[PDB]
Structure formats: C-alpha cells, structure tokens
Amino acid sequence: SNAMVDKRESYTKEDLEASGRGELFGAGGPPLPAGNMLMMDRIVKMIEDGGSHNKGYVEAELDINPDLWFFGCHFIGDPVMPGCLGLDAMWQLVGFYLGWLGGEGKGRALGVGEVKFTGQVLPDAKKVTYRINFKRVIMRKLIMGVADGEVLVDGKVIYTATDLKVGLFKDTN
Amino acid sequence: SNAMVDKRESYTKEDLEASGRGELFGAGGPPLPAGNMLMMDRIVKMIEDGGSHNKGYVEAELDINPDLWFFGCHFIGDPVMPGCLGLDAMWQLVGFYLGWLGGEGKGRALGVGEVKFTGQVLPDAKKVTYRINFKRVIMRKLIMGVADGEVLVDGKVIYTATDLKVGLFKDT
Ligand SMILES: O=C(O)CCCCC(=O)c1ccccc1
Ligand SMILES: O=C(O)CCCCC(=O)c1ccccc1
Numbered sequence: 001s002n003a004m005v006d007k008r009e010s011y012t013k014e015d016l017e018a019s020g021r022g023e024l025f026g027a028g029g030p031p032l033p034a035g036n037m038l039m040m041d042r043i044v045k046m047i048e049d050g051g052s053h054n055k056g057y058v059e060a061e062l063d064i065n066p067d068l069w070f071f072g073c074h075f076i077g078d079p080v081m082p083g084c085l086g087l088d089a090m091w092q093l094v095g096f097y098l099g100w101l102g103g104e105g106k107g108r109a110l111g112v113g114e115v116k117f118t119g120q121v122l123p124d125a126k127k128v129t130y131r132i133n134f135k136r137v138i139m140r141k142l143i144m145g146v147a148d149g150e151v152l153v154d155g156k157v158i159y160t161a162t163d164l165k166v167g168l169f170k171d172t173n
Numbered sequence: 174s175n176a177m178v179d180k181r182e183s184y185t186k187e188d189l190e191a192s193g194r195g196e197l198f199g200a201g202g203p204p205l206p207a208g209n210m211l212m213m214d215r216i217v218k219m220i221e222d223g224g225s226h227n228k229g230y231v232e233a234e235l236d237i238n239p240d241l242w243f244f245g246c247h248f249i250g251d252p253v254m255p256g257c258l259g260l261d262a263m264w265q266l267v268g269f270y271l272g273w274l275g276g277e278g279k280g281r282a283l284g285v286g287e288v289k290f291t292g293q294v295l296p297d298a299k300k301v302t303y304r305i306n307f308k309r310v311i312m313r314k315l316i317m318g319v320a321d322g323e324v325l326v327d328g329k330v331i332y333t334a335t336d337l338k339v340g341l342f343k344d345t
Pocket of ligand 2: 091107108109110253254255256257290291292293294
C-alpha cells in the first residue's frame with residue numbers, strides 16, 4: 001500500500017490544496033480535485049472504526065459566501081449551489097478515505113444508489129456539512145468503498161445519498 | 174402555462190446562452206445554468222411524448238476540447254470530466270423539457286435513483302451525448318419530471334441514471 005500518507009484525523013484548507021497537488025498522500029495516492037472543483041474547506045473528522053457501521057466516518061465542511069463561483073452561474077437571477085457539487089463532495093470524501101488508509105491509485109466515482117434533495121444552499125448560508133458513513137471498504141486488489149452520506153446546510157439535512165461508490169485505479173488508460 | 178417559449182425541436186449554443194439569461198422561455202420559465210455550469214453546446218432533438226416510454230425525449234451534445242475548465246482542476250495531472258457534471262447535464266435537460274412544455278418556475282433537481290459510471294470523458298474525446306427518456310411528466314399543481322438518462326462519449330455508453338427527478342418552483 002502507499003506508505004507516504006500524511007495521515008491525521010483532520011485537515012485544513014492548506015492540506016486540501018496540498019492534496020490537489022498530490023502532496024498530502026504522495027505520488028501513489030488519490031488527489032482531491034483542485035480549485036473550482038474542490039467542494040470543501042476542511043475535513044473535521046476521519047475515524048477508521050467510526051460511523052454507523054464501524055467501517056469509517058468522515059465529516060467535512062464548506063464555508064459559504066455569496067461570491068462562490070457556482071452561485072453566479074447557477075442560476076443568473078436565482079443563485080443556488082448545484083446539488084451535483086454537494087454530491088461530488090461526498091464522492092470526493094469517499095475516495096479521500098480510501099487513500100487515507102493507504103489505497104493506491106487515482107479516484108473515480110462509480111455511482112450512487114439513490115439521492116434525495118429536499119432543500120438548498122443559498123448565498124446567505126454559512127456552513128455546508130458533509131457526513132459520510134462507510135458500509136464497505138475493500139483495501140486489497142481492487143480498492144473500492146461504499147458509503148451513505150448526507151449534506152447539511154447550517155445544521156439542517158438537505159441531501160441524502162445511499163450507496164455512494166468510489167474506486168481507486170492505478171491505471172485508468 | 175408560459176406562452177413566451179420560443180419552442181423549437183432543436184436549439185443552438187446561442188439559444189442555450191439565451192436560456193441562461195432567461196430569454197429563451199421568458200420571465201416565467203426555468204433558465205439553464207450559464208457559463209461554467211452549462212454542460213451542453215446544443216440540444217439536437219426534443220420530442221413531446223417521444224422516447225422509450227412515449228412520455229418525452231431529449232438529446233443534447235457537448236463538444237470536448239482540452240480547454241474545458243473542469244479538466245485542469247479534476248484532477249491535476251489526471252484530467253477527467255467530473256461524472257457529477259454529466260449527471261447535472263441530465264437534470265438540466267429534464268428541467269428544460271418541463272419549461273419547453275410551458276411549465277413555469279425555477280428548476281431544482283429532486284434526486285435520482287441508481288447511477289452507474291463505467292467509463293470516462295478524457296480531453297481527447299470529441300463529443301459527449303446525453304439521451305433523456307421521460308417516464309412521467311406532471312404539469313399541474315406541483316410540476317415534476319421523472320426520466321431515465323444515458324451519457325455516451327464518442328458513441329460509447331459510460332453513464333446511466335434511473336429515475337432522475339426535477340421539479341419547477343415559482344417560489345423558492
Ligand atoms: O442543483 C440542484 O438543482 C439541486 C439544488 C438543491 C435542491 C433544492 O433546491 C430543493 C429540492 C427539493 C425541495 C426544495 C428545494
Ligand atoms: O468524476 C468522477 O469521479 C467520475 C468520472 C467518470 C467515471 C470514470 O471515470 C470511471 C468509472 C469506472 C471505471 C473507470 C472510470
């Protein structure tokens with residue numbers, strides 16, 4: 001497995017930017033997206049035996065302000081964070097967890113079982129929270145994770161996802 | 174319903190930009206996302222009561238070039254179109270269809286059933302295709318569309334989505 005992981009229980013914005021550049025986990029591990037595709041500012045908790053199935057728990061946050069890039073283009077005259085990007089943040093975190101445990105390769109989302117959106121992130125919000133509860137983690141041969149996740153805005157659940165799936169791949173050609 | 178719709182069977186890039194500005198359907202109708210959230214260059218066909226369930230069909234295309242913004246940040250050194258954006262293109266198209274039929278309000282995705290990604294869009298691809306087969310359209314009281322979708326890259330199916338759901342809301 002990948003020995004180079006700077007493995008800590010929480011990560012700062014600068015850590016997440018380092019991850020985008022491949023530095024946090026090193027050359028063999030999955031980077032987060034960078035820049036406009038990075039959907040978190042911090043990871044507040046990662047616990048290997050945690051969560052609703054004792055298979056892993058991850059919690060992360062995105063600070064909201066009215067000038068985040070997606071508000072101005074989605075939609076003109078009706079700013080709302082794209083639900084697809086909150087879904088992606090959850091996929092991002094599943095792949096990150098696999099790399100955090102030493103999984104080698106680049107991350108690719110494989111899909112999700114069901115997503116329900118019941119509320120929205122508006123420019124007057126302050127905090128988006130992502131919660132990930134792992135249900136299966138395969139760390140041998142073909143590395144893959146399955147988890148349930150929720151997105152909250154200022155403490156209120158607005159999205160649920162069941163059976164988020166992400167794999168790591170040493171070669172994607 | 175909304176009588177202002179410039180209703181045609183296909184739409185150009187300029188039409189989609191007009192939609193982002195609220196012009197194509199007018200004041201009462203759902204705009205598409207603009208700029209970096211617009212995930213299509215053209216709508217090549219819309220068929221009322223068409224498709225696999227005879228409840229509606231939409232097909233759209235996105236031309237691929239290495240300059241598209243998402244390649245450079247997802248991921249550094251390993252470009253791949255985010256699957257979440259291809260999923261969003263499908264939600265975008267469901268809402269657009271509801272507005273095309275005269276539905277009033279702003280679009281919001283409500284969710285999706287099972288989504289499977291089995292391949293990727295790389296920067297040397299030429300064209301992504303989105304195919305939307307509606308299964309139900311509700312145009313009164315609480316406007317909602319439910320559809321299945323497929324995403325192809327250069328003719329190869331790479332994503333499937335079951336039970337995409339989108340609503341229109343006059344007050345959010
Ligand atoms: O990007 C999207 O289109 C999803 C945005 C959030 C969903 C939403 O605004 C909502 C959904 C159900 C009920 C009320 C609001
Ligand atoms: O944005 C993502 O994370 C998903 C990208 C598309 C899925 C993909 O690249 C893939 C899926 C299965 C096997 C190989 C590649």
